[PDB]
Structure 1
Amino acid sequence: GPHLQSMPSEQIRNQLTAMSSVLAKALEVIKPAHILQEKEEQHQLAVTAYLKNSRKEHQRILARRQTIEERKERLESLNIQREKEELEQREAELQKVR
């Protein structure tokens, strides 16, 4: 706990020079740059392309995951039914033995 205004001088601790060199150099290539924004405008174009591929797949997932969703309420319930109902089958069967 400090008791005073924050004025630390610079000190070097583990992952200082590591994560500084990651991000402090990154920022220089973000804020000014004539090389970045073109690349990102073409990353934008690969991002548009993926939503464009997506809206086609979404229209199929609108059919497919609809058929998954509704059936997953029935089938997966019926599966965990048989998980818990097995404890009855364990019990009344073993009673028949003795």
Structure 2
Amino acid sequence: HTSRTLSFGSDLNYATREDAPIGPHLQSMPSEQIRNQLTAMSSVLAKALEVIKPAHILQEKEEQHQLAVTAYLKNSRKEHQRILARRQTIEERKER
């Protein structure tokens, strides 16, 4: 009231509550923007991971794809033959 002035925002200590109306919406005040600022680095950089299309890490993806899909066909019928022996292990443990 000394210069009759209202001030919106301008208080950077404020921990925001859960039960506010999120109504008609703009960029918020900075007490909602100095908090949740590590997210904006975390969100847009992984969106920026697309826009390069970087060619070296793509080959580490597909070799990790090819080794993983062939790890199934190499390790197939070795878990299912032990789970059948684990299936018999139930019928001796439950009778125990």
Task: Please state which band the TM-score falls in when normalised by the shorter chain.
Answer: 0.5 to 0.7
Matches within 5 A, 1:53-72: 53-68=71-86, 70-72=87-89
TM-score, normalised relative to structure 1: 0.56
Structure 2 unaligned segments of length 5 or more: list them: 1-19
Partner of 1:74: 91
Please identify which structure carries the higher helix content: 1
Uncovered stretches (5+) of structure 1, i.e. residues with no partner: 80-98
Which deviates further from its counterpart, 20-29 or 5-14? Answer: 5-14
Structure 2 partner of 1:9: 28
- Larger radius of gyration, structure 1 or 2? 1
3-12 vs 38-47, which deviates more? 3-12
Runs of 4+ in 1 over 6 A off after TM superposition: none
Between the aligned residues of both structures, percent identity stands at 7
Find the residue that maps to 2:93 and give its secondary structure.
helix
Separation in 2 of the partners of 1:38 and 1:20?
A: 25
2:42 paired with 1:22: yes
Partner of 1:88: none
Tell me how many residue pairs correspond in the alignment: 75
- Aligned to 1:6, what secondary structure does the other structure show? coil
Separation in 1, partners of 2:22, 2:44: 29
**Could you tell me which residue of structure 1 aligns to residue 7 of structure 2?**
none
Give the letter aligned to residue 93 of structure 2: E
Which of the numbers 26, 31, 43 marks the counterpart of 2:61?
43
TM-score (norm 2): 0.57
